[PDB]
Amino acid sequence: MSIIGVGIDVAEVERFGAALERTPALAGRLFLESELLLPGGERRGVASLAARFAAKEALAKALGAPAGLLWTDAEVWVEAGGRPRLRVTGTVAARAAELGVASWHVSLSHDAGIASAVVIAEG
Amino acid sequence: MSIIGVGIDVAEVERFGAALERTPALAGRLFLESELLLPGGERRGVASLAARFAAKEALAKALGAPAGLLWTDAEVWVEAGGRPRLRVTGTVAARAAELGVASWHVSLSHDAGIASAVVIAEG
Amino acid sequence: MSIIGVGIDVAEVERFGAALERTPALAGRLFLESELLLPGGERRGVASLAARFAAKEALAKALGAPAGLLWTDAEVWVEAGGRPRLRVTGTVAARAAELGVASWHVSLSHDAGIASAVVIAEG
Ligand SMILES: CC(=O)SCCNC(=O)CCNC(=O)[C@H](O)C(C)(C)COP(=O)(O)OP(=O)(O)OC[C@H]1O[C@@H](n2cnc3c(N)ncnc32)[C@H](O)[C@@H]1OP(=O)(O)O
Ligand SMILES: CC(=O)SCCNC(=O)CCNC(=O)[C@H](O)C(C)(C)COP(=O)(O)OP(=O)(O)OC[C@H]1O[C@@H](n2cnc3c(N)ncnc32)[C@H](O)[C@@H]1OP(=O)(O)O
Ligand SMILES: CC(=O)SCCNC(=O)CCNC(=O)[C@H](O)C(C)(C)COP(=O)(O)OP(=O)(O)OC[C@H]1O[C@@H](n2cnc3c(N)ncnc32)[C@H](O)[C@@H]1OP(=O)(O)O
Ligand SMILES: [Mg+2]
Ligand SMILES: [Mg+2]
Numbered sequence: 502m503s504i505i506g507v508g509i510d511v512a513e514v515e516r517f518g519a520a521l522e523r524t525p526a527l528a529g530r531l532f533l534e535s536e537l538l539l540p541g542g543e544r545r546g547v548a549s550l551a552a553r554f555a556a557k558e559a560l561a562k563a564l565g566a567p568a569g570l571l572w573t574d575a576e577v578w579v580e581a582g583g584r585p586r587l588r589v590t591g592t593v594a595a596r597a598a599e600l601g602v603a604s605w606h607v608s609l610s611h612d613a614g615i616a617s618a619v620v621i622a623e624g
Numbered sequence: 625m626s627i628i629g630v631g632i633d634v635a636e637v638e639r640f641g642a643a644l645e646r647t648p649a650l651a652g653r654l655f656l657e658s659e660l661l662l663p664g665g666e667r668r669g670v671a672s673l674a675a676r677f678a679a680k681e682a683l684a685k686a687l688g689a690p691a692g693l694l695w696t697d698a699e700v701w702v703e704a705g706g707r708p709r710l711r712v713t714g715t716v717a718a719r720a721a722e723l724g725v726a727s728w729h730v731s732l733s734h735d736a737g738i739a740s741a742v743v744i745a746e747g
Numbered sequence: 748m749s750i751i752g753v754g755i756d757v758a759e760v761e762r763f764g765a766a767l768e769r770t771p772a773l774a775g776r777l778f779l780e781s782e783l784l785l786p787g788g789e790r791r792g793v794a795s796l797a798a799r800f801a802a803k804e805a806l807a808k809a810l811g812a813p814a815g816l817l818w819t820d821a822e823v824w825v826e827a828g829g830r831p832r833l834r835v836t837g838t839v840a841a842r843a844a845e846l847g848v849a850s851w852h853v854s855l856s857h858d859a860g861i862a863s864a865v866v867i868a869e870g
């Protein structure tokens with residue numbers, strides 16, 4: 502395997518929350534139902550959501566951000582141990598296959614009113 | 625070798641310095657004596673320290689942040705050329721062995737009142 | 748191939764623009780003519796330029812930031828699809844050869860008055 506792409510993204514939490522409040526349908530456009538919930542069942546907060554948005558932008562970047570990709574075809578899930586993970590389906594999986602991506606790595610940080618993600622695509 | 629994990633962490637310098645001043649024992653809990661000094665012998669400043677804290681969080685993230693890890697079992701050292709490096713011992717080395725990590729890569733930045741680190745674990 | 752280095756850099760856009768305005772010769776010292784233009788032909792703006800500066804710092808970091816490297820020996824170019832790319836020549840290529848670097852990966856983000864880059868060197 503070799504590195505096929507890297508992405509980084511930094512989002513302002515306040516701006517992102519304002520985007521969500523302005524267009525009620527937006528959250529469901531960007532996120533699967535599972536992503537909108539905490540492991541317990543509570544609704545996920547805006548900073549954690551901004552970090553997942555940053556993950557999806559970073560993932561897009563690592564794939565060369567082509568047209569035709571759906572936000573709901575990338576999913577951030579969470580291991581029992583707490584590690585965030587990427588699962589790709591449909592349009593995003595198809596693009597990753599064009600490029601030969603076998604493995605995804607993500608990390609998130611959110612603090613200081615800002616959410617950051619890095620994504621590495623390997624294959 | 626393949627990538628086994630990635631971590632990113634962004635820390636607010638002011639907040640971190642306030643944490644250090646509030647609990648005198650904290651610095652010695654987070655850092656080895658060597659990390660608290662500049663190559664000359666002067667005491668390392670708060671921004672540079674916040675960046676090493678971010679490195680250790682990022683390293684934890686790349687390992688899936690399990691319980692039982694000691695801050696003093698990760699060490700940021702510095703090459704003659706100035707490159708920051710990671711050395712892992714004890715509990716952190718043990719966890720990296722569980723995952724098959726052979727090689728560590730780190731970079732630091734601190735500026736704008738914020739410290740950032742990225743860590744990649746390969747093996 | 749394995750990872751040979753990683754770099755991250757975060758630059759304040761305002762500070763960087765002030766540096767450019769203060770010393771007219773600075774832009775031409777840091778950037779090739781091609782980097783100072785948008786694909787159309789318009790002059791590239793300060794935030795996008797700060798992000799390319801961050802890329803070159805990040806690239807320097809991934810190489811262990813030795814003496815003797817020229818800013819104009821690293822070039823950020825842009826694919827038809829929009830992906831940013833690194834090309835290295837002269838002094839920067841020579842240093843990458845010392846270390847065995849075969850492949851470069853970069854991503855950029857600029858938002859919230861700040862520009863960020865990550866660079867990975869593989870070989
Ligand atoms: C995986 C998924 O969920 S995809 C689902 C559908 N969503 C998408 O495809 C969204 C893709 N995102 C976009 O189109 C974005 O506008 C991007 C990636 C082009 C830019 O990201 P933003 O968050 O808007 O801005 P940000 O400042 O973080 O990034 C800009 C940088 O991205 C980089 N970029 C631009 N196009 C691309 C591309 N095709 N591939 C990779 N990087 C790119 C550039 O370096 C740019 O800076 P520059 O113009 O100064 O060189
Ligand atoms: C190497 C050493 O020095 S270890 C020594 C002992 N120290 C440690 O083990 C510290 C480990 N650190 C922690 O427990 C931290 O609270 C962390 C890593 C869980 C989070 O980091 P913080 O700096 O507190 O917050 P930050 O916002 O930067 O990171 C949060 C993100 O980390 C990610 N995260 C949470 N748990 C884990 C995990 N087990 N592994 C990897 N990433 C994780 C999540 O994506 C989370 O955001 P989300 O809840 O919105 O998904
Ligand atoms: C590819 C090219 O275009 S090279 C062309 C010519 N330009 C250069 O060579 C510029 C090289 N840049 C420098 O000298 C910079 O001052 C650097 C890389 C040392 C630091 O970057 P800056 O943007 O000034 O500050 P920033 O806070 O982002 O980075 C500082 C961190 O860089 C790291 N660093 C220092 N020296 C090195 C090195 N030789 N290699 C890698 N990382 C280093 C350290 O972790 C440092 O933080 P610390 O002192 O708290 O440990
Ligand atoms: Mg952004
Ligand atoms: Mg943090």
Ligand SMILES: [Mg+2]
Nearest residue numbers: 735756757758
């Ligand atoms: Mg900087």
